[PDB]
Amino acid sequence: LAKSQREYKLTAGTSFKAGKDATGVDLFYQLDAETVIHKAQIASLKGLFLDSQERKTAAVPQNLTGLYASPVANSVDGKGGAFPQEQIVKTWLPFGNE
Amino acid sequence: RPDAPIPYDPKELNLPLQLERPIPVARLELNHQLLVNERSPYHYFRDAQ
Amino acid sequence: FHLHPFGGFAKVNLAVNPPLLPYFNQEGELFIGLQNLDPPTALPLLFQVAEETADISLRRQEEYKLQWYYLKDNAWESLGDRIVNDASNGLVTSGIINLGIPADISRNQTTILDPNFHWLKVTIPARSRTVCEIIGVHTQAARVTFKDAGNDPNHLGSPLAGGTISKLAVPQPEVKKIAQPYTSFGGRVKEQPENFYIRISERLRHKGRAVAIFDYERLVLEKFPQIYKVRCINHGQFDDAQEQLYE
Amino acid sequence: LPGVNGLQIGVVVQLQDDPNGEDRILVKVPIIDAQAEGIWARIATLDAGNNRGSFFRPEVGDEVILGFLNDDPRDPVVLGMLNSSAKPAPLRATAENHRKGFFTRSQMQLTFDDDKKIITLQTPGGNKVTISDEDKGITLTDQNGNT
Amino acid sequence: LPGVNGLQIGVVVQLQDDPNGEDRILVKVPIIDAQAEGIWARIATLDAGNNRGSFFRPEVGDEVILGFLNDDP
Amino acid sequence: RDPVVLGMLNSSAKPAPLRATAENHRKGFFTRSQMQLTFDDDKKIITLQTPGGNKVTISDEDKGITLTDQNGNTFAMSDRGIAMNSPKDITLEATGKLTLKATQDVSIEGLNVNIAANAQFKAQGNAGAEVSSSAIAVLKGSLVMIN
Amino acid sequence: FAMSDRGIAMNSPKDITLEATGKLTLKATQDVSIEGLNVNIAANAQFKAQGNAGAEVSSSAIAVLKGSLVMIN
């Protein structure tokens, strides 16, 4: 949204332009349901992992062996490393590892 | 000093401890390099009050 | 004071016999911190997922659903009964989860995390390897569908490239930007005579029933176009727990 | 749309609350309608950029000069303010023309004197900073008598 | 009166002694008559108001740009 | 074939340095690197700022002049007089004579005090002169004359 | 006149003066050093100097202690 707005409402059936086709005709997409837009954004992501001896048997942690933390979860190393620029798919682990 | 504090790690940020005036402080933390009977120290203290 | 991960802390009152250390009991946790929230409200969140990276050993059991919480001045509260729709099916496919955010979320006396944000939390008790990997998490998301107005019959044969849609058909000044970060999904073209002949000649032989190697293979390749090759194994069983095949 | 010739006179009505965040000003034209509040116009200035430029804004009632893009009445542009006998200039013009500078609403001044080569900053309370070639030095004067 | 198109070039002749206290300047236009002294014109500036504004004045001989209200010479 | 530039423009894609208000108290010049020369008509303040923290302020609310450095050095003239503060050092040098004078008491303090003259040294009280120490007190010379 | 990361410095080829109608105070958390060709200290009333770990007065030439009445210890 624009800086002077607080909310905005889009109604079902609103149209969007998708360029031209292989024959030179225009393409269009429509909105499926009513939506409302505001100013909320995601600011940070963090992750925590609790290791145990019960992992190999797929049960609840009972005999603990470590607690690991990733303060910047959306990165290569979990703490702010950058992705190689030539990588097509850039994925990360949601909780981390040991 | 709560208005001129020292960070735990000079390479990272932490939240200043909330005191009404300067006091001396001691920190007790668990040792992460130890493993006793293949278990962590936390395994022994999670359930202590 | 309790000393918490990521640099937070908490005050302690000995009259109530608190725990000595902060308490943790679950195998996986993800914390999500948000900016410029105005509760109560509704948050659609888009989870883009890498669908090939999960564990196929066994299906996630019911005792290990995902759990959702929100923060209220160092106390966590459940969100289980305010989720309208989760199109990601528990973080196995890409989709939008629709959360309703109540008015008693708080940020005045938070000390265990950054006090400048509002905080949500997703946890898993066990078998955290059955959760896929993530590509992005976003707010202000919506889904749209193609509508034909006399276009090429070969449009639906290939996905739409990321970054194509950025404009509104009737533009409005209140909206400042539109973005399409990923490709499209789920299209299929109308049948041409040759594929028609292939389908009907195969049906005239297996009659729509599966009794032999030929029948299992052709009934799959026709219904699911996203498969490239398949093989039918006769009198063979697969053991999920051992990852062993019995001949 | 029927067009407009030349430049026009405008009067300022409102400075704030632009419906769009474009930094425009509400101006009316007395020869079209002196009763309506007018339309939003853009300002051309001495310097402007991304978080950059000279920021001076007129006050309600000030007289300005208007031009129009492509001679379209719906696209006014402000080209500068004007003085008159009803709104006098801060200095009287002379044949020697020795004094220049900036004067503000509250009578604070930043001025240059080309006769004696003096640069001075003044506040109406008496606080003054002077760089002078006649005095061959620097002087800081306070309203309390500190020198 | 026959009108004028576009913008023109002017040359300054006198700064002071406006017959009316309006703070105008005497300017001539070389393509109309380079021998006459010209007419009194108004100045648009960066800031102006009641005893307020930026006060910079050209010198005799300086070149300036001229516009006209309602295309009136 | 004869274009002429008449000024620059701001927009939502190139925001102005300040947001417009109904009171309209602040004016000045802002640059690319965020150096400022500004006027405040509400409190009658003139200020020059550099993003590093170096600041010069002429103020009517403070009734004086203030020079502030990014290192903590501070110089001020106000209704209480003149004050100077430095976290490191203060020096004073002259090729002629350095005079200090007051109409009230003069006070000198420090961890150690060293007075050294290349020629005669002289101290004088007109109603009594005192020299003392909590430890040994020493009077030395080539020839010592008491009274 | 300069303020920089080394502190405050003043230099004059001719003279430096300081006058006040109240009290002039000089203070440091380190040593204070005064130099010159001649040093003259003069008070209209009592004059007093004091070291807390020893006080020394000396000269390479004659050293003089004078008064109407001199009391040693």
Numbering used by the authors:
A (entry chain BH): 297 to 394
B (entry chain BH): 494 to 542
C (entry chain BH): 789 to 1035
D (entry chain EJ): 370 to 516
E (entry chain AJ): 370 to 442
F (entry chain CJ): 443 to 589
G (entry chain AJ): 517 to 589
Question: Which of the paper's sentences describe this entry?
Answer:
Contractile injection systems (CISs) are a diverse, yet evolutionarily related, group of assemblies that mediate bacterial cell–cell interactions. Their contractile apparatus is homologous to contractile phage tails, using a contractile outer sheath to propel an effector-loaded tube into target cells. Here, we characterized a CIS in the multicellular cyanobacterium Anabaena, with features distinct from extracellular CISs and T6SSs. In contrast to cytoplasmic free-floating eCISs and cytoplasmic membrane-anchored T6SSs, Anabaena CISs are anchored to the TM, which is mediated by modified tail fibres and a baseplate component.
The resulting maps of the baseplate and of the distal end cap reached resolutions of ~2.9 and ~2.8 Å, respectively. The transition from the inner tube with C6 symmetry to Cis8, the VgrG-like spike with C3 symmetry, was facilitated by Cis5 and Cis7, which formed the first two layers of the inner tube. The cavity of the spike towards the tube lumen was plugged by three copies of Cis6. The highly conserved baseplate component Cis9 linked the lateral baseplate components Cis11 and Cis12 to the first layer of the sheath. Cis11 and Cis12 formed a hexamer of heterodimers surrounding the spike as seen in previously studied CISs. When compared to Afp11/Pvc11, Cis11 harboured three extra domains including an extended carboxy terminus. The second additional Cis11 domain seemed to stabilize interactions with Cis12, whereas the third extra domain composed the cage surrounding the spike, which was observed in the in situ structure. The cage was further surrounded by the crown, consisting of six trimers of Cis19, which are not present in other studied CISs. The wide connector observed in the in situ subtomogram average was composed of an extra domain of the baseplate component Cis12. The amino-terminal domains of Cis13 proteins bound the baseplate while the C termini formed a triple alpha helix extending towards the TM and penetrating it.
